[PDB]
Amino acid sequence: AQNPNCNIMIFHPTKEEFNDFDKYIAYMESQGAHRAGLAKIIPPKEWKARETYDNISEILIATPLQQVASGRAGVFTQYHKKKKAMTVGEYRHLANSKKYQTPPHQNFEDLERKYWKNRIYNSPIYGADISGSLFDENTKQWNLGHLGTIQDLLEKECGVVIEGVNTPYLYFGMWKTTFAWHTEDMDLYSINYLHLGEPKTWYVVPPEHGQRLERLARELFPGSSRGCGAFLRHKVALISPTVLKENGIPFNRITQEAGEFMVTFPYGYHAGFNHGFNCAEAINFATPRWIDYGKMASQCSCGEARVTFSMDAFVRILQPERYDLWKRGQD
């Protein structure tokens, strides 16, 4: 079995290997990459996402979100307070302000220490889930707006034709902006490209150990767990690496820098934080190996998780028994 310790693998495809996206995912899996839940892909030196980022300031962040924490430094939840619209240029100036800017630090490890010590005492503002793309239309390789769609994958594997669409989303971050512990909708893959700016630190639990994380989360968030049998689908709970180690949860960590891709694999729980002003693009995708995870994915039916239109079909076809309860939670 490849990668039996479930380490995060880093790949350096050549320009020729960068042509066929599906093939390369399957290659990474042949080497055991999925066992970690997360892999990094460094593009070939010849590749670029677009020519420059000099002209992005007029993108609108319609609903910036202030991430307000509750709990203790290593075990907390966050809620998202809506703020007034602002442009990417306005958001960048805010991120760089004395109130929000990255503190002085020695290296990524020092910054990570500072994040986990101090995160809860601040409320950073995040631009999330902004439909759109920063890839040039002429970028042919690893262009996250030109991937094969999940609806087409389901039709190819299973024969069923379904409604829905699959487009990318932009994220604008600042110091301490935080992504809570989660798997993807329907335990899909994700891919994330860091277009510009400061790094993103990731934490990940191997898919084969995801239920260990779920059991700790039910212990640490006991009211949330009583409220919903899949409350991590609410994407609000944080647990620090120190707490994970104290509780024997297997995990790994890595820092993504600008110009790098990260792939998350089905049922790979992940969480993390941004180091400073940045812009990322991400989208969910599927492969044939996803189908069995889609069929088994947990679902939130309490009403909290509310998700895209296109997830309807996935539940309807892959999880017909669950469909009525889950759709009630959507309505």
Ligand SMILES: O=C(O)CNC(=O)C(=O)O
């Ligand atoms: O940019 C982000 O925070 C969101 N990314 C992830 O949780 C991911 O790509 O799966």
Ligand SMILES: [Mg+2]
């Ligand atoms: Mg612009």
Ligand code: NI
């Ligand atoms: Ni994710």
Ligand SMILES: [Zn+2]
């Ligand atoms: Zn729920």
